[PDB]
């Protein structure tokens, strides 16, 4: 129900997040904004080499306690 995950921010420092399986990706990004001050629209979260889309939840990606997400900046292929 209540778990902790890790996020590797842009500077390389590792932060800990208090989350729930039901939390959406945008809620996670909101927590990232609270701790690091980066707007969600500028955040791109990666898990297992794959981008995490906003609409889905941590359960949808089977993200479990003490998993580590990687934060990069929003990007566009062209």
């Amino acid at each position: 129900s209540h778990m902790q995950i890790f996020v590797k921010t842009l500077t390389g420092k590792t932060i800990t997040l208090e989350v729930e399986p039901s939390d959406t990706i945008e809620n996670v990004k909101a927590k990232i904004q609270d701790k690091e001050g980066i707007p969600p629209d500028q955040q791109r979260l990666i898990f297992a080499g794959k981008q995490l889309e906003d609409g889905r939840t941590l359960s949808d990606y089977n993200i479990q306690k003490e998993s580590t997400l990687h934060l990069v900046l929003r990007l566009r292929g062209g």
Binding site: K8, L10, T11, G12, R44, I46, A48, G49, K50, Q51, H70, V72, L73, R74, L75, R76, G77, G78
Partner: protein
């Protein structure tokens, strides 16, 4: 420039992300080789793709030149290994490290942009017939990256 390149190297040796590896080939600190593992549950699954990185003199204030050396099937990557990606051009940030760039490139591997493609044909396959796209990408992965 060199101090930060050394810092990124120390970080990559001590605690690299599970997905990628990078380091200077030979004695040149400004020319690196990189390795990306194809993400799971994808046509590139199980692949190992190599890349070249060239650091400009005023890095990190100018982006690095990153190119695939392993042939790969992707709309936004061409036969010469060039990557059309905005964070390598006008959306570069001095805070981005090589590790972050490589993770970015993987996330691009599984989330292409067919609307504005580098290879129009591959994009046509991706939009019209996804099954064929996945088949061809898997074949290319087996032949060239395994």
């Amino acid at each position: 420039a060199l101090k930060r390149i050394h810092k990124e190297l120390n970080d990559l040796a001590r605690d690299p992300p599970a997905q990628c590896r990078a380091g200077p080939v030979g004695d040149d600190m400004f020319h690196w080789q990189a390795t990306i593992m194809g993400p799971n549950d994808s046509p590139y699954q199980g692949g190992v793709f190599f890349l070249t990185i060239h650091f400009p003199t005023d890095y990190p204030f100018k982006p690095p030149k990153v190119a695939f050396t392993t042939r790969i099937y992707h709309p936004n990557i061409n036969s010469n290994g060039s990557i059309k990606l905005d964070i390598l051009r006008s959306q570069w940030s001095p805070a981005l490290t090589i590790s972050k760039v490589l993770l970015s490139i993987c996330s691009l591997l599984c989330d292409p942009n067919p609307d504005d493609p580098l290879v129009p044909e591959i994009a046509r396959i991706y939009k019209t017939d996804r099954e064929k796209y996945n088949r061809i990408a898997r074949e290319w992965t087996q032949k060239y990256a395994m």
